[PDB]
Structure 1
Amino acid sequence: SMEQVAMELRLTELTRLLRSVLDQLQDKDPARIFAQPVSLKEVPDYLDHIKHPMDFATMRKRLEAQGYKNLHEFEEDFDLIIDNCMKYNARDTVFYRAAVRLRDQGGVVLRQARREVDSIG
């Protein structure tokens, strides 16, 4: 149908906007602490602690399959990155501190993304 196409065009544009948001959030992680999944070879107990692991490469795979229907879904995944780290790592660690900084800096990016998504529909 023409409607399914129109729908698919909106998704594609959402994907375009989320790709830019993702690049901006990932620049706030210059140490690449959150770039890849926590290694189960190097942290063999990880899944005993963290039930839904997440990282920027995993988000990128979902993104490019147009797997985010709306901003709320994308934000859920970004919040997993931060919240998982803040539970697994203690407060006095470079990891926890990196998550706090990513959260704080990402807030600005995500604030304007929500306005853009509502604005452009």
Structure 2
Amino acid sequence: ESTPIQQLLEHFLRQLQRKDPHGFFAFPVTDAIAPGYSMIIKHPMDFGTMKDKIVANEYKSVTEFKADFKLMCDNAMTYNRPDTVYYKLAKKILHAGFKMMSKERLLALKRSMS
């Protein structure tokens, strides 16, 4: 079964993945679909890998989850040119998670759960 932190992270993940309806961020980027990806991007990340990590209870904190989320977005903005769908979508998703998981919103959540 599940734990409170897992339920919270699943919620954040679900809200974020809704902004990627075509699934560009859904599973690991292959070298076949992105030439040279593994050369340029040393630490790949995607929503599916993150979900698996939530299920395995690997995130000890929201900070650890936010780090992988930011990594996924940063990889897409690093490997792709600014005028691409991937870069623009990564920037939109990053802004959404930054707002959703802000320190201020997390403080308020903490206060409600005291």
Q: TM above 0.5, one fold?
A: yes
How big is the alpha-carbon RMSD for the aligned residues of Structure 1 and Structure 2? 1.9
The structure richer in helix per residue is: 1
Q: Which has the larger radius of gyration?
A: 1
Q: How far does the alpha carbon of each residue in 1:31-54 deviate from its partner, in whole angstroms, 9 at most, with x for none?
A: 321111101333352111000000
Over 3 Å off, 4+ runs: none
Unaligned runs of 5+ in 1: 1-10
Amino-acid identity (%) = 40
Shift of 1:89: 0.2
* 1:31 to 1:113, Cα distance in 2 relative to 1, 3 A: farther
How many Å apart are 1:115 and its aligned residue?
2.8
Confirm or deny that 1:82 pairs with 2:103.
no
- Structure having greater relative contact order (Cα 8 Å, sep ≥ 6): 1
Gaps of 5+ in 2: none
Number of equivalent positions: 111
Please report the TM-score for the alignment, with normalisation by the length of structure 1: 0.82
- Aligned partner (choices 8, 11, 34) of residue 25 of structure 2: 34
State TM-score, norm by structure 2: 0.87
